[PDB]
Design a protein around this nucleic acid. Sequence first.
RNA 1: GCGGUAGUAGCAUGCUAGGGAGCAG
RNA 2: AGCUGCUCCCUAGCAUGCUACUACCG
Lengths: 585, 585, 187
Amino acid sequence: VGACVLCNSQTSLRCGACIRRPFLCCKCCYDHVISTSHKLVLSVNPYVCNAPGCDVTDVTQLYLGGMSYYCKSHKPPISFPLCANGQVFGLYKNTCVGSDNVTDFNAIATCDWTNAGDYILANTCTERLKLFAAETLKATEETFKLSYGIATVREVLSDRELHLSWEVGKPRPPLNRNYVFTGYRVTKNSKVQIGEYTFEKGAVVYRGTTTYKLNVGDYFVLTSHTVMPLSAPTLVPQEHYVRITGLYPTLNISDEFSSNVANYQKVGMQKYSTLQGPPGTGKSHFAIGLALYYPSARIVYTACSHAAVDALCEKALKYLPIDKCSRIIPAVECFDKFKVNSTLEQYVFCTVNALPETTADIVVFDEISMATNYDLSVVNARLRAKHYVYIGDPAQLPAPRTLLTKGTLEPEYFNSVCRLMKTIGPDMFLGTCRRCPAEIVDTVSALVYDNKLKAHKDKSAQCFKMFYKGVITHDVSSAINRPQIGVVREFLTRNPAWRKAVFISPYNSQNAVASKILGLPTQTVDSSQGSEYDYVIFTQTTETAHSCNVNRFNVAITRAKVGILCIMSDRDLYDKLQFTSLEIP
Amino acid sequence: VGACVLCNSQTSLRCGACIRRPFLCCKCCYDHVISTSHKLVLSVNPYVCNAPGCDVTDVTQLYLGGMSYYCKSHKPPISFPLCANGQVFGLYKNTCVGSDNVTDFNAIATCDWTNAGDYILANTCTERLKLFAAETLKATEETFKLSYGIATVREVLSDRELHLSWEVGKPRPPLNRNYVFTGYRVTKNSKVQIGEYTFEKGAVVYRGTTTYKLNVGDYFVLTSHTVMPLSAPTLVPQEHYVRITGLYPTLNISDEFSSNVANYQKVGMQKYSTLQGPPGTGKSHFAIGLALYYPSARIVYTACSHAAVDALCEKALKYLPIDKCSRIIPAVECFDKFKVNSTLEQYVFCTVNALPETTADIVVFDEISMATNYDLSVVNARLRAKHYVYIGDPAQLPAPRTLLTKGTLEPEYFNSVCRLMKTIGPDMFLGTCRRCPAEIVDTVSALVYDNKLKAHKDKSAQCFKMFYKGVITHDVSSAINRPQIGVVREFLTRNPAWRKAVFISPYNSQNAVASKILGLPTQTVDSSQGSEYDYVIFTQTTETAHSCNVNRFNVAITRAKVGILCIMSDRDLYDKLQFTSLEIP
Amino acid sequence: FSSLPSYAAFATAQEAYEQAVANGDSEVVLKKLKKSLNVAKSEFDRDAAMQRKLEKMADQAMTQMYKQARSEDKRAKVTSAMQTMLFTMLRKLDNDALNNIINNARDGCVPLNIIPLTTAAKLMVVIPDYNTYKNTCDGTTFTYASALWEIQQVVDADSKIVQLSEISMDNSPNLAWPLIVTALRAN
RNA sequence: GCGGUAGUAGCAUGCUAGGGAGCAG
RNA sequence: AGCUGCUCCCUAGCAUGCUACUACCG
Ligand SMILES: [Zn+2]
Ligand SMILES: [Zn+2]
Ligand SMILES: [Zn+2]
Ligand SMILES: [Zn+2]
């Protein structure tokens, strides 16, 4: 027992029927339970009538019957209503202030997190209430994700190709590269240890963790975690230092980090670093640059996935002596180039999923778009450093949301730090980019790139443009273009030097079937971070908003040192982004 | 204590004066107690006036007496009537919805199961009420079968011939081949272990279990069981697969089973196999055909009697390897060609009477005609496999009913599955028969054989038929024709090659006596299953409905590869079925 | 009680009484109305105060009935548990040695203390220190109770496996030192 | 005016029952 | 994780008893 969230007074009650059973005071809980449909409260004992085999679970109908709570037809001669006076009988009934404006918590509870206003309230509410919204999001997605089917493989067709069989009553969720499956191997006693995999249609193509034998009867299931409550908020109430505290500047100047010397002082006197950095503007070069700002300082690496800490690592093998550094991995498939099970050190690479509890000096965050309110806050919830960096930008895709069907989340309300670049403003950016020719910078600036970025090296006049509409026949959550992959069929072979490029499609089924005629490597822009290639191909597929919005293009256009093909179907960003247009074969 | 059958709500009361004391709710119990004359209810204690040496057992005249229930003339000053408000005082008096239409269970309770409407309600009522009706039928038969006399043998005349004596107050039942006797050998302490025997008039002829000495004073009694309640219904709510689940088709085709290939897929996607199959059309050949459809499958062989599992076995010595196979026999005389006391295997043959509890894949049912609502449901009450076979047909005789004296049971209401071939339709049948020439196929089709079947090989023109009337003087339940066995006397010796045939009679007294002039083996069509012979004789005897009807005639005619004799007395099926007719000597 | 016969009589009696009081007719009218509403509250007393012992007694009976049902279910549960235990421990003693030593008795009675000594298939020895180990369970096989046993598996007080090569006189001070030897009866 | 019976409220003694705790052999 | 004996505190029930107030009647 303890204090409540909305009210901060000590209480002993819960919403039984609500999601994550928060602490709520007498009048506090009364408002929450009378304004909406949660009508089950838990004290040290639950509020139910102990009548043998009775049914009722309401709160406003049960009464007191001496030692216990009883039903109306069950109650003794004279009683005392448990729910009166505008209060529910509980601990600390006097020191309770309550509240009037309860529409916030009521909406957050009764919501299903399906539409845009859901997240509008999730951010625009109280910060503790937004932590609660984060945990409610996690619980809802966990409950909805195990509710799908079980992959009961029965055949063995080939390697990376099998046949699927699923049970009655549960549909089969979108076999995407977004949500990883999880399987266990059968035996007479138990069934365990196959790992996490990723399936899609083929015959069924599977993406396996590590090579082994494919047995019969093994199930592949989207398993869930045991998510836990949060302690610290998203970020700290912020501050500007009077001095360079716990820090002292360097003595020399670094060639690769001469472009960021103006970025050293500006955050050495505050906690956070509000980054506005497009993919490939020296995004991670400062993660090793500001690292050697003072090698005695304790820098904390975070990552969205193991691929993010790999991009944070794939250049740490040259400038960083490995005398004392490590990365955290719990008891899979990834780079492990540093120490394992070493935590308190000079440099700690880490994915937020298994970060230990310590205190340090620097915190080099990994791209902020993927982070929601939950996982960004986990860092300061376990490791409370007292000045930060927030590498990343809402300029790219976030971590996707499963049942977001009505109008998709806006490019402002990703998470907490995300909003104050267009509410207070940014301080962080490199005036130089790293891949982009003139085609990928200036016209992209009229987008949410703020009319801010120049080109690295000058124009190539080589990124292609199309003029068509496309014909589509779509599967359960995927859609392939017979003609629009037939139009690129003419562009590829008739431009013989064009095929060092990787064609990407967010409907990876397109990349599944395009390898049958062309064989180019498959890739989706879901994990377009880390991929940095010279020639790239892209298409529009459907002209609907699953890919048409700003954050869905700009992960794919900003890729090339030379050029990218863009097969257009719609006219919005066809009129927005301009490239060289030619004749249609 | 638990839920009631009519209501599915928890209760604590019994219909005490009623047959099988089923669970009934408060309103349920009041309807059943006030609509008809069972007026004795049992709570955790009985509703009986505890006055010393009282006599009242009624429910509505007893009153409360404080701790106990007390009689009107013995009740305390102020009481509380136990049966008012339209309810009987019992547990869970609130959560009981009751029912209005109680005529069904009332009629099922008060009936004696002697006429046709009895079984009409036993079938057309609720399926759980069909379980209850099956148990009620079994209880009525068990209490009526022991109520007959005791066979007190006191003589020793010869082997298979003795003399009977029965006590006062009990008649001796029909000495039939339908109900088996049971004897126990006398000694000074107890009397046990002679076995199951079958008697009839001689002198008294006995069909003995196994050879032993016939002592003096041994009784032979129609001993009853201690039958138990049921759990599972007749059959599972049905379903058609989207795949071949729990199964995988074979690779080759079989010569013996190329006539059934079209029947493989048709139930490979559902549970039950409702079969319309005339006796001997490949009736059991598919049991070994579908068995090796997939030899890894778990196939459950049921049996009607050990003769039925023998007909299942009498062909299994060749196409089946005995590497892992068995049949069940509890601690007698029959074939036991496989493992004993082995249950969970590749194949287990079994008679439902002693089947254990496991889980399997295939269930090959033996002919459904005998099976009642009880016995067919027993199999899935103990072994719940999840696709079934229902080999059998209402085309033949069922197991007889003892006191079925009024209107005989109709050929549609045998059991559950037997109704939906002329209510929904049948799916299984072999378009080939195995013995029948032209005389026993096409004309039989105008009967309940659906104008469906052809001959195996063509006409023989050898079946015999007569034109007479018959004269009968009958015993307690048997009837012998002195003249009509005298007219076949002229047919036999004056056709010297006629005497390979066996003469049949439902009144085996005819076959008992015809052996005194002819000596041909005795046989009745009570167990005409398994008997498949070249030459056969039959006669009509009395023209009444005991043997003239559809399932009573057709059980005998479908027998010969060449021909059978048909001695008619009535003109219904003389005009119905036509054969070779000649002059009467 | 709210809808019992006394209520209508009492209510209408006082309604008419007070309507006539508002009329204010006589001096005996007050006495008569007050006597009526004395004897009509003498109906709402027996019918509304003693009617409530019936309900309380019925509830006493109902709670007793619930208690008896629960106590009756627990008995069946424990009966099943006990007979399952008996039958499961039965399936280990019906050997051929037990039949032998029972058919060698002159009445079928034998002392119980000799049943494990002559029929048990496995032996367990608990050893406090090294000298006792050297006197009893030395080597791979030993003799005891007129039989010969062969060793398999040795553990210590922590239930951790010890190899037969570690039980020496020099390595003794490094072992958790009750030792438990398990041996099998040799034919 | 008193006695009795039927009601309502408070107090006292003990008797059973349920729960928590302490000591001794 | 046992068999007894003694003591303190809290709750509920019933009987008995005391005392007080209303009603009927004599
Ligand atoms: Zn709630
Ligand atoms: Zn209740
Ligand atoms: Zn009844
Ligand atoms: Zn009585």
